[PDB]
């Protein structure tokens, strides 16, 4: 960090490195979230396609 009287700012940490990639990840949760978002976008596309047909 480099904090100042206006705010914080990232700098290259020499003390330690963050994990970034978690050791454990709920893969099915992530897949289901992506499936939900793509299904929502597909439903929006289908609704607007029905509107286009009308």
């Amino acid at each position: 960090y480099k904090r100042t009287k206006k705010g914080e700012k990232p700098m290259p940490n020499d003390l330690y490195d963050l994990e970034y990639a978690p050791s454990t990840l709920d893969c099915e949760k992530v897949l289901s979230s992506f499936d939900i978002e793509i299904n929502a976008l597909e439903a929006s596309k289908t609704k607007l396609s029905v509107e286009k047909g009308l």
């Binding site: 700012k9 990232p10 700098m11 290259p12």
Partner: protein, 475 residues
């Protein structure tokens, strides 16, 4: 100050009815010619440039420009995105970047008194971008003419329309579109256009030639000691990079005499083991020092009345005192005569940054005026038979006197790092025979003398340009 008197009406001038003292000082009644921004320059609106994300471009802040209009661009790539330059990339992505159109005269908005006016000459290459804090002002009466008419002359009036406003002195394009440029200036300057550009180009070509061979005041001291002691220049700045110094308990006591176990002390000991691998000349300085004083640093007033006092700014990398006092005191100590410099003394610097601590200087100037040196100096009276004071000062200003005092000097506030008599007396400097000395000195003396000789020629042609412009615009 001033007893300026004006009349309500006046503040009617300009579409912001402003009545700060500076503007109203610049207004004055006028009887001569007027002009406007019309028959001269024209402000250019800003635009976002199409940056190519495959090649290293350039960029230029306001600090990257100098008072002489010499841009020093930095080279970014968009393939690095390092967190050190991340601010630059972020402000570029924000939209704080544009590209001059080869003929405009960029003017800085913030603090316009520091001559940040720069010229993008027509015939050139290696396009450089710029910050929106610069004002594209592309002219219609030839770029060089307006550039030289704005740099030296027409400067008491660009600086008198700035917005102080509880902070930054700042110039605004709208105010910039209101200056009352006289015609006799431009009339006379364009009348002599055919030869003014020629001789000014010759002068700036000579300036460029001088700058091409100009060298820094520290590298000269850095190379001769490097070229005389046969030490490679690319390892002591590579050994100083790695930081994993490991020591044992036994090594703490060795030559310590105060049990100091800070990291910087151990790294100093490691670097000393490298700077003296092949050099066999090292002798303790403690047995060549005969006395040590500090000085006297009372309260001081800048440009006041009393005995002048030196500061840390007066010690340069060449072992010569700058002897250009600024502060002046009026206090007494009943022993003031003990601190009145006098020629021949050696003054090491106690108290400065981690890199500017230990810089010594010899008073080589003859001054009949008594000048006090502060508590921030240390006067060394060494035997003038083995050390040759000037050589000692040059060594202190060399990497020998940098890689040591950067890692041995003490204090919790590393912004005012200070040395003490212990580090001076426990300093194992390499002292070659008196035959070897006066050769490093002398060589360094002539090299720095040449560098200083071409330091007034630059500020002789840069002044010749200004005086020629002033004479031509006044004839």
């Amino acid at each position: 100050g001033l007893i300026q008197r004006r009349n309500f009406s006046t503040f009617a001038s300009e579409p912001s009815v402003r009545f700060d003292f500076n503007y109203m000082k610049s207004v004055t009644p006028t009887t001569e010619e007027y002009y406007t921004y019309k028959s001269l320059f024209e402000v250019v609106p800003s635009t976002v440039p199409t940056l190519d994300e495959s090649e290293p471009f350039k960029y230029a802040e306001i600090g990257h420009v100098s008072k002489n209009g010499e841009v020093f661009p930095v080279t970014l790539s968009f393939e690095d995105r390092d967190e050190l330059n991340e601010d630059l990339f972020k402000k570029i992505e924000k939209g704080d970047i544009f590209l001059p159109e080869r003929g405009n005269i960029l003017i800085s908005a913030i603090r316009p008194y520091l001559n940040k006016i720069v010229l993008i000459k027509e015939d050139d290459k290696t396009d450089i971008y710029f910050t929106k804090a610069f004002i594209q002002i592309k002219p219609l009466i030839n770029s060089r003419i307006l550039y030289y008419a704005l740099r030296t002359i027409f400067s008491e009036k660009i600086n008198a329309v700035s917005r102080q406003g509880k902070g930054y002195p700042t110039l605004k394009e709208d105010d910039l579109k209101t200056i009352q440029f006289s015609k006799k200036v431009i009339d006379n300057l364009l009348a002599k256009e055919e030869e003014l550009i020629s001789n000014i180009d010759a002068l700036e070509k000579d300036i460029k030639e001088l700058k091409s061979i100009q060298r820094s005041k520290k590298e000269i001291v850095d190379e001769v000691f490097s070229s005389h002691f046969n030490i490679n220049m690319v390892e002591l700045m590579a050994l100083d990079s790695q930081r994993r110094v490991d020591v044992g308990l036994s090594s703490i006591s060795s030559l310590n005499s105060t049990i100091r176990y800070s990291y910087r002390w151990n790294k100093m000991k490691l670097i000393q083991k490298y700077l003296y691998r092949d050099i066999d000349c090292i002798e303790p300085l403690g047995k060549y020092i005969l006395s040590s004083n500090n000085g006297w640093s009372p309260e001081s007033v800048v440009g006041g009345e009393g005995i002048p006092i030196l500061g840390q700014e007066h010690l340069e990398f060449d072992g010569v005192l700058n002897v250009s006092p600024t502060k002046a005191t009026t206090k007494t100590k009943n022993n003031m005569e003990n601190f009145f410099i006098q020629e021949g003394d050696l003054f090491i610097s106690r108290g400065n940054t981690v890199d500017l601590v230990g810089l010594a200087c010899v008073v080589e100037t003859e001054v009949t005026e008594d000048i006090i040196y502060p508590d921030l100096y240390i006067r060394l009276k060494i035997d003038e038979k083995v050390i040759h004071k000037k050589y000692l000062a040059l060594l202190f200003n060399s990497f020998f006197g940098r890689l040591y005092f950067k890692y041995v000097s003490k204090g919790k506030n590393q912004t005012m790092v200070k040395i003490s008599s212990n580090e001076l007396l426990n300093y194992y400097l390499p002292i070659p025979p008196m035959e070897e000395q006066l050769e490093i000195v002398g060589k360094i003396e002539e090299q720095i003398g040449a560098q200083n000789e071409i330091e007034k020629q630059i500020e002789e042609k840069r002044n010749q340009i200004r005086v020629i412009i002033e004479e031509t615009a006044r004839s």
